[PDB]
Design a protein around this ligand. Structure first.
Ligand SMILES: *[C@@H]1O[C@H](CO)[C@@H](O)[C@H](O)[C@H]1NC(C)=O
Lengths: 48, 24
């Protein structure tokens, strides 16, 4: 479910927040996301 | 047979340390 506050357990990465579609350019080997202060930003859906 | 001449690597041989996307 997107555009709604949900607890996520993406591949063992636990957390809380809101998810949606993105236009990122993940390289095929890229799996996680982060920012300049090292906080997980984007998670590649393991089943999508 | 083979040779063992020496050259400079210049700026080359940098990989992605992790599998974590980053921008700007
Ligand atoms: C997940 O597995 C199902 C069952 O084999 C398959 O139909 C689907 O395409 C798979 N999806 C991914 C992203 O691997």
């Amino acid at each position: 479910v997107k555009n709604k506050c949900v607890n996520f357990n993406f591949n063992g990465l636990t957390g809380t927040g809101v998810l949606t579609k993105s236009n990122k350019k993940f390289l095929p080997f890229q799996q996680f996301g982060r920012d300049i202060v090292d906080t997980t930003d984007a998670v590649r859906d393991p089943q999508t | 047979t083979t040779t063992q001449s020496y050259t400079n690597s210049f700026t080359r041989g940098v990989y992605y340390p992790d599998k974590v996307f980053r921008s700007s």
